[PDB]
Design a protein around this ligand. Structure first.
Ligand code: MG
Length: 233
């Protein structure tokens, strides 16, 4: 029975109507694990995020209606947690555990608009003791990782090159780009610039590659980001 992992920047959940439509969308997608970014919930308001079928919901949130991340696990998934690491500022959350007795390490990250790849590299640094051979890093990196991740096809800046080098040192690869080397799909559109970019990513341990059956982008009506879904064997 295959595990599916979904990542979606939801662009805010402080409204009830949004929360109801996220719930219907998640229940239609039926993911085993769902990573959400920019819930915009404060540390006070986390119990507003509830969805039938996904009772286990881990969340990292700051004090303001900014950022905010969450990892939802399906009630149908036999999940045993071992470690949950929450960003005090609500920009990332790591959940470690086992499903069907396989260990999985999931880092859900929401990088800020400014200095995104530096922030990510620092997070990898802060969390290096918990990175392993079954690590998935997904979320809104707010940065392309390679030239084909932007409609402009411009080269990635120096900060991004260092992040990629840090990823390589940790034996981490862009799973989406590995499965789709020539892909020209995008997850975000910036109207000021008429620019399209893939700033949402699924990065993982190289040892997980053989378990990565399919990965695809899912456009939607809920948010200004498209989702990414990964199917594990
Ligand atoms: Mg946003």
């Amino acid at each position: 029975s295959h595990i599916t992992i979904l990542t979606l920047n939801i662009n805010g959940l402080n409204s009830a109507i949004k929360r109801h439509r996220l719930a219907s969308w998640i229940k239609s997608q039926d993911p085993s694990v769902c990573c959400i970014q920019e819930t915009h919930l404060t540390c006070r308001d986390t119990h507003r995020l509830k969805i039938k079928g996904w009772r286990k919901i881990y969340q990292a949130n700051g004090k303001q209606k900014k950022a905010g991340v969450a990892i939802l696990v399906s009630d149908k998934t036999d999940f045993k947690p071992t470690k949950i690491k929450r960003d005090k500022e609500g920009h990332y959350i790591m959940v470690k555990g086992s499903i069907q007795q396989e260990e999985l390490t999931i880092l859900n990250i929401y990088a800020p608009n400014t200095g995104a790849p530096r922030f990510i590299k620092q997070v990898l640094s802060d969390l290096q003791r918990d990175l392993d051979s079954h690590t998935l890093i997904m979320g809104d990196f707010n940065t392309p990782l390679s030239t084909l991740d932007r409609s402009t096809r411009q080269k990635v800046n120096k900060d991004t090159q260092e992040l990629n080098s840090a990823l390589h040192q940790a034996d981490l690869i862009d799973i989406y780009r590995t499965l789709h080397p020539k892909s020209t799909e995008y997850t975000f559109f910036s109207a000021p610039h008429h620019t399209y970019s893939k700033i949402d990513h699924i990065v993982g341990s190289k040892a997980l590659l053989s378990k990565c059956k399919r990965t695809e982008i899912i456009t939607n009506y809920l948010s200004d980001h498209s989702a990414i879904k990964l199917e594990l064997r």
